[PDB]
């Protein structure tokens, strides 16, 4: 009985929390109390299998019993279930209450307080890494335990809760790229990404060892993205124990991680810094360019030889990004398919490493260009610059999505331009790949752009260059200027700097959608007249009045220019 075995392995609480997540990720609209009762029925059924492992369904797999409880055939059943996981659920914005109201619920029933936390997050991020969600609940609880007894509860609690919100969004977007990598482009593309990421991380490890961890890693994320959260949880547990047992053959940075408890150990290993490179590392010319078995290896063992090139290039260059490395490996691949059918193969592929200089500088120049711009403008205005830029690229994308994606795109400047000039590319470009997958999955629910569909579906490694090479769209028909977007009320003066800037930025998109050929300096004139307008009328004694009257004036000047 797999269900009685899993229940005795985890205990009731941890068994219930992962079943709660699994339901919340699938049934994203049912209320909390209905999920709780659904979890209790699966828990009460697991206790009858402990008593008598020969009962009604104790021989069925827990994955099968979950769909059995879901309906109230395989493997098409789960595959059909997976098509109805909503990336943009129509749910209310999570408005967290007063600090004293949250601390009252936290002290009244802490076990339920955290279940609603798990429920509210999982129902909004149906691909959240379930083991990491459990870790987030531990830190969420830790902040309430400390701050509800602090002298200033809100000064303690709110900053910590804001950090978890930001960290949870990043975790959801990283894991969603992983799941989309598997579902859309296959496990073959996920293994390629993991071999390059792990070769950067564990340069001491052998190709067979990195390939072994990638097979285990592909199963952990297959289960967490295909719904078996309890097998995902145990598989990443086994992988942390295996990585710590064999750490001497993998990495020297794991010793600190391996002394920690299960949740923190698995987390520590995922966040571990790169290991030092072995000193006695040859140049890649020897075995891949100058060797005499290059076309024989490519012909005889294509996947091991090419995956060996990626591994060997990735561990030598942790200052490259994973998408840059996968591009280098594909270039080397296509050069050998061309060159190995030639007269003298060595006479043509002798200069293969010369085609990598273009591919490596192209992201370098883009990042230096954007970091240079971010130093001048700053986060808010850098986002405005990208908002203009990407609204001109794909104006069919909805205004909420254009604002969200562009704001995130502008956070790469704050995140990655504080790093030394050589550590910028992995930070920048791998984050850009994560934000563009946000746009790719929000646009795949309701496709409105042929270009976005094009960049998202064509490849997965060339997504950032695809979008970056996009010019202003000519096919787009300007939006009829609606003045309902540029007339605000006095409520804007009680908003946060963030929420207010989102309102300003939401105008900028609807402005560009109307005038897709406006100059970048012309669009900055309106926005500068915009900000002076909101500042003035929020200072006025009669705020409601001059928002109406001076608002009309500001609309006239913008339309006139």
């Amino acid at each position: 009985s797999e269900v009685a075995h899993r229940f005795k392995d985890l205990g009731e609480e941890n068994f219930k929390a992962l079943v709660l997540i699994a339901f919340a990720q699938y049934l994203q609209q049912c209320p909390f109390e209905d999920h709780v009762k659904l979890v209790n029925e699966v828990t009460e059924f697991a206790k009858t299998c402990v008593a008598d492992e020969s009962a009604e369904n104790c021989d069925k797999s827990l994955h099968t019993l979950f769909g059995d409880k879901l309906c109230t055939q395989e493997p098409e059943r789960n595959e059909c279930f997976l098509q109805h996981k909503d990336d943009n659920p129509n749910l209310p914005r999570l408005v967290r209450p007063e600090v004293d109201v949250m601390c009252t619920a936290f002290h009244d029933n802490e076990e339920t307080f955290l279940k609603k936390y798990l429920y509210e997050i999982a129902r909004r991020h149906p691909y959240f890494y379930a083991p990491e969600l459990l870790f987030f609940a531990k830190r969420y609880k830790a902040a309430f335990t400390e701050c509800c007894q602090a002298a200033d509860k809100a000064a303690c609690l709110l900053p910590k809760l804001d950090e978890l919100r930001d960290e949870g969004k990043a975790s959801s977007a990283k894991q969603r790229l992983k799941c989309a990598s598997l579902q859309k482009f296959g496990e073959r593309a996920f293994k390629a990404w993991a071999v390059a990421r792990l070769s950067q991380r564990f340069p001491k490890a052998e190709f067979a060892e990195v390939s072994k961890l990638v097979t285990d890693l592909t199963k952990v994320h297959t289960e967490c993205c295909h719904g078996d959260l309890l097998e995902c949880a145990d598989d990443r547990a086994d992988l942390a124990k295996y990585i710590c047992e064999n750490q001497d053959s993998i990495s020297s940075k794991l010793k600190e991680c391996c002394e920690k408890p299960l949740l923190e150990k698995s987390h520590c290993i995922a966040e571990v810094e790169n290991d030092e490179m072995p000193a006695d590392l040859p140049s890649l010319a020897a075995d891949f360019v100058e060797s005499k078995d290059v076309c024989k290896n490519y012909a005889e063992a294509k996947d091991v030889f090419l995956g060996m090139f990626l591994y060997e290039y990735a561990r030598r260059h942790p200052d490259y990004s994973v998408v840059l490395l996968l591009r280098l490996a594909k270039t080397y691949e296509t050069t050998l398919e061309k060159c190995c059918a030639a007269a003298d193969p060595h006479e043509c592929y002798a200069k293969v490493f010369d085609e990598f200089k273009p591919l490596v500088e192209e992201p370098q120049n883009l990042i230096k260009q954007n970091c240079e711009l971010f130093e001048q403008l700053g986060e808010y205005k850098f986002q405005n610059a990208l908002l203009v830029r990407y609204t001109k690229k794909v104006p069919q994308v909805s205004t909420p999505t254009l604002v969200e994606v562009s704001r995130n795109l502008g956070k790469v400047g704050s995140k990655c331009c504080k790093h030394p000039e050589a550590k910028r590319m992995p930070c920048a470009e791998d984050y850009l790949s994560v934000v563009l997958n946000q746009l790719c999955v929000l646009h795949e629910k309701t496709p409105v752009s042929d270009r976005v569909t094009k960049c998202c579906t064509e490849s997965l490694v060339n997504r950032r260059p695809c979008f970056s090479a996009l010019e202003v769209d000519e096919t787009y028909v300007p939006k009829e200027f609606n003045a309902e977007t540029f007339t605000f009320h006095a409520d804007i003066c009680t908003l946060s700097e963030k929420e207010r800037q989102i309102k300003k930025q939401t105008a900028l998109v609807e402005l560009v959608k109307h005038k897709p050929k406006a100059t970048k300096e012309q669009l900055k004139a309106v926005m500068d007249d915009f900000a002076a307008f909101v500042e003035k009328c929020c200072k006025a004694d009669d705020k409601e009045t001059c928002f109406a009257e001076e608002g009309k004036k500001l609309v006239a000047a913008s339309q006139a220019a």
Partner: antibody
Amino acid sequence: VQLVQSGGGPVKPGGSLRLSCAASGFMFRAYSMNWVRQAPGKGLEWVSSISSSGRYIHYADSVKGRFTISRDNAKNSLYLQMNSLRAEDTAVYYCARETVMAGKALDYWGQGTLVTVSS
Amino acid sequence: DIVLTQSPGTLSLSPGETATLSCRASQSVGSNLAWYQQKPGQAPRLLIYGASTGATGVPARFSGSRSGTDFTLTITSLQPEDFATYYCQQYYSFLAKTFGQGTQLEIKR
């Protein structure tokens, strides 16, 4: 995928032998190679294991100090130097290949070589 | 080094029956456990790797399973060429690869 073994035979106690494994049919330079032995009528015993580049080498406690594993990646060959041979080292010795990405299981074995340590 | 203990030493069954072989690990080895089949005079042959995943070409009546530190190899529609000796091997330990003592399938007549 071939693992052609060579070099066993009889020796006297304390003597030396050198086992060879000539591989072909796969990118030998990417796989870890193993030596497994089986005494006549007994079970499998793991002897040594060498990684792709030869960086990580492991021995069973029984042969620690006497056996030395090595490989020539240019010649696609695996070697086992057996010194200070004992009568308990009498067995059929197999060179096995590790799975490249399925773990450290042994998917291809050689035909085996018989080593008899007797006076 | 982790000790793998196989049971039983010998299994006497008739063709068509189901064989159930045991391999008990002294410590947890995760799913880093392989099954091998060996016929007289032949080199071992990989059957199962990763505790449950069967090797390419292995028929479907061979099925491995893990429950904690106890591993089971099950052969369901025993054919005459399924009768051989079977060994389990772990590859979790950093220090050594250890095998089991082996279990022999014998045709009961």
